Design a protein around this ligand. Structure first.
Ligand SMILES: NC(=O)c1ccc[n+]([C@@H]2O[C@H](COP(=O)([O-])OP(=O)(O)OC[C@H]3O[C@@H](n4cnc5c(N)ncnc54)[C@H](O)[C@@H]3O)[C@@H](O)[C@H]2O)c1
Ligand SMILES: NC(=O)c1ccc[n+]([C@@H]2O[C@H](COP(=O)([O-])OP(=O)(O)OC[C@H]3O[C@@H](n4cnc5c(N)ncnc54)[C@H](O)[C@@H]3O)[C@@H](O)[C@H]2O)c1
Ligand code: NA
Lengths: 488, 489, 491, 491
């Protein structure tokens, strides 16, 4: 049942947030957002055009060069961010409902993971605003040498639909902590949650134009941001194809880019794994968030001795998941975010069948309406098959036998991706030997899918450029100035 | 200046490439010529790297990275290798400085005192880092050990220009090597000799086969093969904005990390309470150092109105007095531009400066009878929209502009697509730190100019680049951060 | 015109003031109590439960059990951080309560206790709440056969003793960094000024600190403090106070090979060179010594003035001293309050006598003020020489010594000829001279064209006999850590 | 099979051994000398100049002057770095000379002195030369009104005292980090083992160290050591050695509020869990104690074994102990040399008798060995209890104690129930159990599936009464530094 502040919000058309103000599109356009469990329209949203991105950017440039955001102390800036965290926590139920309605994930996991992650995130980055230190370099007695880590200026941020609010924080926490200002575009599929949270930025006391949210379409609002002459730096999370474009375009202006893109991450069950723990790890690794997760362990490698056991366990668990609407208490898995996404994973399933793979579970739509896909388990697969190389992005796992540690490292590594990886082994040497050898940004040894504001996240190879999260994330929003003072 | 025997012997033969630890010719026998810019004579014939040769270099670098000595070796052992190399470079300092003077065109004495010694010092400095490239241990929860590894990114492709040839090879390789990367490096076609002589010294220091591979040639073939190679993990370039754009564009197809060091139009700013003597010299040397073939050159000299006439007069005199000659003549203070193409380009900018209404207070033409020389030039009666105050000329060309307030000069100095460096001259403690804080540049010198050191980072804001070189900072470009979570529950 | 008492301080002051051990409010086991006064009136302000060795003992066992097991030992870093941040919010919410208590118990003016002490305390806890998730160790690349990493573990139960001159702020300097690291605490506030801290105990409870993490044991140096210094089960000791007591502590800690952090006194020079902006430097000079009644360790007790400006700054310093409005801290018009005790008042009046005996001129002040209270007049000493008792030793009152100099190399040597080295100020408009002078002075803190600035993010401490170690900033965390180097064979 | 003396050590030992003060080789002012012995043969190995209080005062003035003015004070970091690297190269050039001096003077085998000691000394200097250019402070973004920065300034003249068991390498531990930061040094080698360091003085001079940057004063602890400890103009003191002398030094240092770092003894535990790889663990347990004849503070002198393997490991250590080949350091066959002195042999023989009369069983050794020299047999003690002298106190010979255990929780407790906390070893093939156990052990360094590993890049130090501070790694630089926070007012 809908919370009253959510009912009130969804009762009017959704406005953009530009220069501390809730506004319509300058030319009045709007777009629809849907509920993927029902396929009905959930809201009508003001649609940002190029001229709106230009208003957002002017407002951001201005808040950065002059005024309170530019005059504030690092303690004062930190307080703003902490207060935002508190506010998001006060409205945890309202935001969780919006993610459940707009994205489609279960309400309770939006509350326990997404909203708590977002809150911890801001809290973490609020602590960095006073600790972004530069250096004093001893070189000569004739010179004082030091570096300042100055905020790069106005940043352009584009994020996807699969963890809408979490990803807004991954982006803004680090950038805001260095003292930048922000033009952010949420995904056309999932703008609501960020646009509700705007109120909380206003109420926490963020000066006008420090943040600006411009919902819309990728080729218009999105591309306006990437091609704008007065955006200093761009950060993107999304598909590899859009990734490549953003970097291409960013080259025209010698603009720093940080990309978080796709994965085909291996999750590896060696002979001395604790089998009961690795099975649950493998299953949650792919099935968490309906498989709509960059870091999903969509290639479960199993030592040959345990293959038939883990496959039997993964089939049983696949058929056991409770499919339903995110706003139903009993739901464990919701649907895909859109019709186009469901069609896409269903075409990947058909491709796998026609290439010779065997569906041991799932492999088809689920329910009467909504964009559901049954959790799917593929067997009899080879490394050269399409389904084993390309990111599917649905609850679809491929399960591969291997006979030696050296073999599985090489097959795990033979990929264009390198975002994450899992390794299950009880042995101390093997754990760290394998972790060392895998070409992946994040390695989990006897676990999978763990994220924290304090730990860096990002890809090797075509999974990205740069890291978000941790201390490392600050570097992207900074510009290093080496000052030399003649004291001779 | 008498040519060293070892230089004589080196120039007496065809100049080989260095791939997988051996001195080689190009697979298909192609060659090109390098000139002495002071005489226009052929200086040496060099083996020209083709696509095929870059391929041989990348395989060798891949092999040295995945297996073998380089891959197994301790950090202390790698540090010792890099240090032995610096010692060798220092032992051959005179040979290297002559090649830098012959090939590039600068005065011997400055190549010795500045270039060679800074090459030695930068390797010396980065050998100390190998053992100190640390990651983190992060406290999150009692249920996990969290730690990060800073793994070397792998095979790295590096392209450099011609204005500081050896020093720039050390800016690229010092940090790369210190992290444990392996390297395919392309020197500039105008100035391959220093680096290919230096190759003898990597071999003698004990570098394993393939750690370092030097492929001289041309940008559209050797350069482009580097940029576009699927097996190179990361690319680093310095040179023209136009080539840098291209490289970042091509790097998008492999989602490949890029470091770019590009041009500048750096302001050198003289406020009312400058020590004027020291600021006039700093202004003159800021633009004229290395014939103005310096991306950080103080090419816009802003002067508070009270001092404007005084510094214009002084820069005209100083400009008129610089002694042009060959780098190998002991009397020479400034040599020539590196090529006929570059002389033509800077002379074109002089004419465009005249067409637009500016006045040439000094110089403004070619000099001498042989050589790509251009006279030191002072432009006056200038405005902010003129192409000469906006674009990188890369010559001994300076633009002198008056101003009347501190806020005004900050706004004008910052209105550039560039942002590499800046100079500020003031005896006031508040104003010095204030002005420096507000200038959008990678490096700011308060009461000095053109100071670089292995330990202080260097790079541009805006279109002057992406990333920093030198210092601790440069390490990060050759690194790949791995976050490891160990469940200890 | 009196600042009216908050209902909550009134209630607090009506009962015996209890100690805080193992999350509970308790009297001393033997039932002893001591009195604390209002130094403006001399009246008894509260009666307080007095901690003996046996009470310190109970606090340590409580600290030990909270460190070895339980919620504080199992909590995530984000959970700890949230606690520390909620604490800062509670302190800000009771800002007026806390500030009335400093003004009453310590003596300083209510308004500055509010604007400065209280907000600095709040700011300090918010800064350290941020470090909790960020105390990072290293991953050292040595050899492909090992995995080498360090952990920065909390050292354990820490013994913390603080003085009376900034009572709440100093409690935050000690506890912020230590709690941030995951340590647990037994902390003795000064017998002159226990109230502020024992009120704040409410707020550690209301924020939800587990029992035993934090324990406050008020009482006397030779009993409660000494029992902290000598307890076998306290892992590390941190002290701020007199140089005499600091040596006793360091000497006693020798017997248990215990890490020690000391913040002691100072004779900090404030240096006005020829090209100072004089109007500013005169205020820096006056404010550098007179802030908090000179009961401030970083105080610019020596004002060095280039000779061109000596007569000018003396005249301004005299006019200013004679103009400060002395009175009760709870009274609105008050600029300067009294000294914390009769004992301290005697100490400073006594240094004033030694100043006159040694030949110096009292240019202003030089005696007690008002009819009651521990007040001393802002004092200006003129005709001074570097060998005099008053120029060498820390007085701790509103007493300043003015010294001319003729050159920069001279003033650097004269400033530096001291056993102390807590802080220094340099006033000069020249870019080179500022940094040159700052580089050459032997002091933990140098302010260039300013004085008495403190912030959570910037470390503070002394060179030579002004201390060992640093407080504030990131540096402070190292005092409460224990480094462990783990090697994992992966051959 | 005798290892043949190097011409250069022949020439060195053929003369009276001189002190190194202010760049020159000198005698003691009063002309006193002392002898050092060959602990294999008990003959006089050399006659060395004895530093007295008056010689420490000369050494301190020279270091003070070298710190305040002259090349060392004006030099760039790149230049300081180059002196330290040239030293490292010269040491490596003289590797055989120096390893023979350790073998003659300390008693350890030549080949191990060369492979370990000399090679680590070199690598230590090489690593610390890399730090001179990278000792960075902070710029702290606090407010737009200030530039806040900190400087890590060298602390000044430092006094360093080292023991006799790893003579040259321990001198590098002290000096690398101290010189890296820009300090100057008065260093006293142990009376038992002065030779390797005073030979190494040739190399400081040949490398181009300015006069006074480094001063070496051989002598007796209660005269030359105490003169360093009690000197008013030494800014900081570092020491490794006995708990007893360390408490003295800290006690004495209190008077000057002088920073102390201490590396003291240990009773380090080496824990074989049920799932250890037993082959490896057995060698680890054996090498862990017997390396350097047990004259190693981090020695695994308490070998804990799961009861499943107790008999298997006791039988193996007994066989290995009875097989060690004892002899002179300069004989080729030697696997273990003698103890350092007659006094050291008598102390360890006393502990063995104490073990016997408390009721423990000597399963091997337990007595002196050979005809001449200060040798003691490798000893295995069994049937031992936690409360026994031999399982509590540091013996410092080739003496191990084997203790069974039944649960992991139990072994963590018994291993931590000690006043010591220098190092520990944990042997388990399980990923989880390795790290959990390493986390719960109260020791400065923990080895997982190995033992006795040290490296210039990884910090070393003790928890509890094993020490204060760390040496090695970046961590060692903080001990020789003094942090200065500058605040520049920019309006
Ligand atoms: N790395 C991730 O976390 C992530 C997230 C979502 C999707 N993906 C991958 O992307 C695939 C397809 O998803 P999609 O097409 O909806 O995502 P997408 O790559 O189009 O990116 C989504 C975001 O980028 C914006 N965008 C689209 N075109 C743009 C343009 N030309 N300029 C600027 N911004 C633009 C979108 O509006 C949205 O904000 C999935 O199958 C999956 O493999 C990855
Ligand atoms: N920490 C270590 O690595 C280490 C090294 C050697 C000995 N020890 C312990 O100490 C025991 C043996 O004692 P020791 O003979 O080494 O004596 P010691 O610890 O006193 O000697 C070590 C150093 O300190 C000096 N010294 C001694 N008394 C001094 C004083 N009063 N002032 C200044 N310096 C002084 C000595 O000359 C020597 O250089 C061993 O059995 C062992 O347990 C520990
Ligand atoms: Na009181």
């Amino acid at each position: 049942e809908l919370k009253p502040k959510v009912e009130a919000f969804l009762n009017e058309e959704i406005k953009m947030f530009i220069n501390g103000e809730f506004v319509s599109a300058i030319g009045g356009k709007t777009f629809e957002t849907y509920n993927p469990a029902t396929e009905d329209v959930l809201a009508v949203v003001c649609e940002a055009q190029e001229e709106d991105i230009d208003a957002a950017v002017k407002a951001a440039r201005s808040a950065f060069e002059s005024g309170p955001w530019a005059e504030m102390t690092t303690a004062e800036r930190a307080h703003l961010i902490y207060k935002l965290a508190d506010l998001i926590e006060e409205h945890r139920e309202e935001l969780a409902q919006l993610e459940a309605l707009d994205n489609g994930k279960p309400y309770q996991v939006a509350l326990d993971d997404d909203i708590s992650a977002t809150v911890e995130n801001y809290r973490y980055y609020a602590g960095w605003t006073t600790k972004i230190i530069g250096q004093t370099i001893p070189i000569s007695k004739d010179y004082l040498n030091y570096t300042r880590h100055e905020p790069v200026g106005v940043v352009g941020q584009i994020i996807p639909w699969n963890f809408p609010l979490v990803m807004s924080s991954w982006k803004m926490g680090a950038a805001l902590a260095t003292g930048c200002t922000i033009v952010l575009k949420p995904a056309e599929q999932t703008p609501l949650s960020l646009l509700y949270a705007a109120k909380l930025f206003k109420e926490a006391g963020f000066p006008n134009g420090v943040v600006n949210f411009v919902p819309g379409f990728g080729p218009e609002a999105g591309a306006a941001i990437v091609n704008h002459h007065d955006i200093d730096k761009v950060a993107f999370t999304g598909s590899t194809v859009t990734g490549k474009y953003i970097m291409r375009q960013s080259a025209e202006m010698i603009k720093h880019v940080t990309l978080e893109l796709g994965g085909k991450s291996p999750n590896i069950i060696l002979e001395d794994a604790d089998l009961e723990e690795a099975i649950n790890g493998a299953f949650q690794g792919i099935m968490y968030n309906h498989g709509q997760n960059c870091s999903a362990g969509s290639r479960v490698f199993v030592h040959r001795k345990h293959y038939e056991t883990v496959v039997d366990a993964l089939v049983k668990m696949a058929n056991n998941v409770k499919l339903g609407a995110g706003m139903e208490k009993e739901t464990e898995m919701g649907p895909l975010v859109s019709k186009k996404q469901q069609e896409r994973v269903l075409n990947y399933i058909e491709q796998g069948k026609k290439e010779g793979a065997t569906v041991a579970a799932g492999g088809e739509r689920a329910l009467e309406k909504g964009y559901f896909v049954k959790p799917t388990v593929f067997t009899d697969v080879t490394d050269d098959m399409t389904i084993v190389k390309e990111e599917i992005f649905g609850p679809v796992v491929v399960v591969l036998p291997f006979d030696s540690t050296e073999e599985v490292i090489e097959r795990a590594n033979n990929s264009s991706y390198g975002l994450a990886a899992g390794v299950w082994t009880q042995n101390i040497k093997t754990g760290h030997q394998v972790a060392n050898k895998l070409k992946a940004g994040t390695v989990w040894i006897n676990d999978y899918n763990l994220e924290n504001a304090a730990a860096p996240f990002g890809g090797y190879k075509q999974s990205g450029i740069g890291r978000e999260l941790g201390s490392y994330a600050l570097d992207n929003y900074t510009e290093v100035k080496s000052v030399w003072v003649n004291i001779k």
